[PDB]
Amino acid sequence: TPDREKALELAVAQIEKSYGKGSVMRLGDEARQPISVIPTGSIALDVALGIGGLPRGRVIEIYGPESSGKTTVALHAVANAQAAGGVAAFIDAEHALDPDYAKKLGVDTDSLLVSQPDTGEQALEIADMLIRSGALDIVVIDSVAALVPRAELEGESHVGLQARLMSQALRKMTGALNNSGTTAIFINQLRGKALKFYASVRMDVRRVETLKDGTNAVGNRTRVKVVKNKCSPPFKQAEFDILYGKGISREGSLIDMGVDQGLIRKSGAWFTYEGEQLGQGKENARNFLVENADVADEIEKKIKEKLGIGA
């Protein structure tokens, strides 16, 4: 028992040294907190990630069905990256992006770099060039499936080289990302093998149930599970709301997590905070916090402090 702890501590340290920090973790371990991360838009997800946002200088996968919210999540990283004076890029093999929607999440679309590559290799190459610049805070790739290799686009037997395309590229890219401190997000749709292992974070995104404003639908309750996490104990999940035309309810997530942490208290349907009241029913509380950014920030401030915060 007394020697065990010494021997196990040793083993973990050898492991932690011989391969990266986060090669082994107890699932109850406190997260090692970096200096800067990329907030996701949802405090719940930020907490589920352990480090209060997405890591910098790493590969990230966000995946799910069509109409999952995965892209929305990605665009908040993009918006937050910019919000902190960073420069963002978007490699587009889907041609689905809605910048009006993106603008209302908070993406500075005007200053967002975008590329619409011909081939899969070209896509990843451009990413790589853009990464090695070291001027880039984030780069999003939309999407994996659409990364069709040159040879296939020309007609040119060797089928399954789209994986070797990714493998080769990810090796080269993974090193480029670490030096620059740029994050790469690969959006990936369910309906590849390399990205699973190179990625430091993997997020499984799903649509749970539709939010209804009486007769009409105003959004969707979204669920995300961190299936892989090399920066903090994995398998955590968060729920939050994506509101049509607005995106992730930061206010709605602050309340959710506020009550969870006991910093917000219930008096029936009434949501209280520190003695003052926030509203009757979640919607009024949500609506109260958007009108009062100062109190919403105070709650965000307090949730972080009561755990590991970024500040």
Q: Is 5 annotated as a binding residue?
A: no
Q: Which residues pair with 276 in a beta bridge?
A: 273, 274
Q: Per DSSP, what are the bridge partners of residue 224?
A: 205, 238
Place of tokens 């999940």: 237
Identify the three-state secondary structure at position 308: coil
Contacts with 216 (C-beta within 8 Å, 6 or more apart), sequence order? none
The topology under which CATH files domain 25-248 is: Rossmann fold (3.40.50)
The amino acid sitting at 175 is G
How many DSSP H helices and E strands does the chain contain? 11, 12
Strand-pairing partners, residue 220, are 210, 242
CA distance 181 to 152: 33
C-alpha to C-alpha distance for 73 and 152, rounded to whole angstroms:
31
How do strand 264-267 and strand 270-273 relate by DSSP bridges? antiparallel
In the chain, CATH 3.40.50.300 sits at: 25-248
Other beta carbons less than 10 A from residue 244's beta carbon: 14
CB 237 within 8 A of CB 29: no
Asked if residues 30 and 288 have their Cβ atoms less than 8 Å apart, the reply is: no
Q: How far apart are CA 82 and CA 80, in angstroms?
A: 5
DSSP β-bridge partners for residue 207: 222
Residue 14 carries which side chain, given as an amino acid letter? Q
Return the H-helix or E-strand segment holding 187. Answer: strand 183-189
Amino acid sitting at position 180 = S
Q: How far apart are CA 35 and CA 52, in angstroms?
A: 11
Q: What is the resolution of this structure in A?
A: 3.0
Find out whether 266 is annotated in a ligand binding site.
no
Distance CA 251, CA 241 (A): 10
Name the experiment that determined this structure: X-ray
71 annotated as ligand-binding:
yes
> Which of 190, 304, 300, 202 has the alpha carbon at shortest distance from 251?
300
Hey, is 293 helix, strand or coil? helix
Establish whether 21 is an annotated binding residue: no
183 within 8 A of 139, measured Cβ to Cβ: yes
Please give the structure tokens belonging to residue 289: 């916090």
Distance of CA 151 to the CA centre of its chain: 33
Could you identify the residue written with the tokens 């105003």?
Answer: 218
Q: What share of the chain is helix, strand, coil (3-state, %, to 5)?
A: 40, 25, 35
Partner residues linked to 241 by β-bridges: 221
Instruction: Calculate the alpha carbon distances from 157 to 152, 193, 252 in Å.
Output: 10, 20, 52
235-238: long-range pairs with CB below 8 Å, 24+: 235/27, 236/47, 236/48, 236/49, 236/50, 237/48, 238/42, 238/44, 238/45, 238/47, 238/48
According to CATH, where is 3.30.250.10 located in the chain?
Answer: 249-311
C-alpha 123, offset from chain centre: 21
- Phi–psi pair at 99, nearest 5 degrees: -70, -25
Instruction: Answer yes or no: is 69 a known binding residue.
Output: yes
What distance lies between CA 192 and its chain's CA centroid?
18
Distance between first and last Cα of the chain: 39
Residue 307 has phi, psi (to 5 degrees) of -130, -150
The phi-psi region of residue 158 (left if phi > 0; otherwise alpha if psi is between -120 and 50; otherwise beta) is left
For 261, the token pair is: 């942490």
Question: Which CATH code for domain 249-311?
Answer: 3.30.250.10
With H, G, I as helix, E, B as strand and everything else as coil, classify residue 230: coil
